[PDB]
Amino acid sequence: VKKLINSQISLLIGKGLHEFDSLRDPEVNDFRTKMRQFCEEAAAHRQQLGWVEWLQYSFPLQLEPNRALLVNVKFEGSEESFTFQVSTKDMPLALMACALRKKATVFRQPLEQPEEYALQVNGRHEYLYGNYPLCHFQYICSCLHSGLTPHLTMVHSSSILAMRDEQSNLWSLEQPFSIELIEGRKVNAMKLVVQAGLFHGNEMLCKTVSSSEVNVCSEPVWKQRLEFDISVCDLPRMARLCFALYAVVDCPIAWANLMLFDYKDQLKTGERCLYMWPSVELLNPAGTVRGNPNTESAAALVIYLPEVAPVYFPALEKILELEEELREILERSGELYEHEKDLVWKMRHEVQEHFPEALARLLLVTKWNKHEDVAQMLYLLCSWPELPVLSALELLDFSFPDCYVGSFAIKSLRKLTDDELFQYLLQLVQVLKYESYLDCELTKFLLGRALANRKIGHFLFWHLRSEMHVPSVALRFGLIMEAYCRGSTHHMKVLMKQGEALSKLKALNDFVKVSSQKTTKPQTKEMMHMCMRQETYMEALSHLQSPLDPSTLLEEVCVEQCTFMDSKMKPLWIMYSSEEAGSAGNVGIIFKNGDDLRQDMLTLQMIQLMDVLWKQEGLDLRMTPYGCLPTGDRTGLIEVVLHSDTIANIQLNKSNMAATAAFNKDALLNWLKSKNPGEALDRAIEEFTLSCAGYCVATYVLGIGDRHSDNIMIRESGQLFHIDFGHFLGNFKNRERVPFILTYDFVHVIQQGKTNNSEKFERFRGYCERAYTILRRHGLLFLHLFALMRAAGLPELSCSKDIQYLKDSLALGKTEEEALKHFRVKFNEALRESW
């Protein structure tokens, strides 16, 4: 069985486990056994969970960030159902009580405590339970706003337990730090030079030192000493030595980093061969500290670390052993002059005692190239009060490379709710890329959270799996996924089923791409359907959890409704239906291969976050933050928003249609009227107005560009939403400041088809202003999350200029009054542009 599980982990993660063995690497070996133990202990805990706790693990609640309500309720093993009038303020227990009383009357009564049950949403992996009014559950809210009757199933605790059960598994060294540069074996045109620097995060620990110049041969020889302007004793624990090999008459060729201490805190010595990474400001301190795995091809640098005595970084116990104030004035950009730094440092105890949230500022002023100073910082850090989540998120930035700081940040982040963790998971995964060692507090934190919440576990898996084609992270991410699989054998098989479906979709899309070059769309479509109706495809593509949202069940693939877009990357449109789910089982996924989906997903997650922040302040802008999930090399899934069309399509203004128009400016309003006749129209126009305000503000703040009428859609409900986000932060395809945008046809709908309607139009302006002012108040959250996202290496999120864009859009250097005046100037400028 162990062999079997080993082969399925290998297949699931995209890497053979024998490849870990072949490295014969103690660090890999230690990571694997330790994390295996950790994860297996998590599994043992899970299998003995109480039944309600099991539900919290496998089906965590979906909550929103008096009134009449009809609900249909049936019991697990029956077609017989009951429709009940309850209240939106009623709790699940009261509803379950009604169900059990009816069951007792219809089926003659003994009878049975509602406390023995939970309510499943029919045909979904989603459950309603807990002391929450029905209107606090997203599902109930969904139905209320869309009009539908909630359909729920009474599921007994013994049924839940069966699910659980079926799913079981030294200061002494004063001399200058020096190295010997020996030789290389590379390819260029000039002479060669090696630049080397010592870094602690972004900060240089002393000036960089450079090689002598040597002719551009294939196997250069230097045999030279590089001495650095720092004492061996002052090397901080997380010191990085960074190399750049380049040609000079400058032509960059390669780079390589390593830690000066190994994973066991031993100071490194003596000889190393550094397999370099090809060069895409020469030195790359944020780059990985592990060598390039393509040793057959990679340029290589051979160096010598001198045996300076075995020496280890001192233990914490040893480390610990070792007037009326402008303080407050400067202490709220955050960049300071040298004298200001001295004051903060001098006043470090006062920072700790009275301004614990200014830790980052203090950290940025400590001299990391002086061991006494670091000791003095660590001493205060070991007694530092826990910080808020927001503050901890900042402390994960590559600017804070020290391991004790890293560990402090994680400690402060443990109070993250699962909902918050889910909101920030993308960024936390990216931060793994900054880690210096395999076994680290971030990795253990994420694994523990993932093992305790199957939804976290699902998205953690896919975030790691989607990057296995990236050599720099393949090893780390492969190891994390293996350990995770050790912690849930059952979830591994659920994930394999998703991977099988994705393998078939890739093969299907490759066929579609070939066929559509040779024949008409109707013909390729019929060929697609014949391919899908093969038993191997019908089986692989049916009965899985959606990778986009594991609570959505993709049951029967609906072949006749599947198609493809006959342009660009030819993405597939795949429809599903589910008898048990009814209408809500009719769902679609888009499979696209050829584009990197990371930027689309990041934009959508930021829009989701805006929607949550707005809703927390009682503002619902009726947004459509649909799912988007990278799954592989320029491959992933996008959630289909049904009953929606593009503005472009509507504006075609085809004849013989319900929307056909005397003036093109009436096409959209006509379309809305056709979908929302009579009294329904007023609601739809309001839905349009709200969502238009949300998207106007979202795209302005994020600097979203390349917006045509084919990348804005509208739902039949009236909700406008943007799709397919290729460009943001003013980087348009170079760097411009994107203005606020008001489109005339949209203003026309908001004004209910009237030329002048200041009453409706100024309401819309008020929504935009409210939305903008709310985001400003959380400005730091967006700044911190985008800073962490720099780890992803998106070309439109690369540097400080990109993050400056958000500082300017949110006008965070301004007062709230000043920011609004400025926003109004932009809104007004945007208004006159409107024809």
Ligand SMILES: Cc1ccccc1-n1c(Cn2nc(-c3cc(O)cc(F)c3)c3c(N)ncnc32)nc2cccc(C)c2c1=O
């Ligand atoms: C549904 C529709 C109406 C008008 C014009 C285009 C489309 N449409 C669209 C428009 N579109 N694009 C997206 C979309 C969004 C993304 O962020 C990324 C992406 F690649 C696609 C989308 C979505 N999520 N939900 C609903 N419609 C969406 N996408 C398709 C993708 C694959 C295959 C097909 C046949 C389509 C497709 O027909």
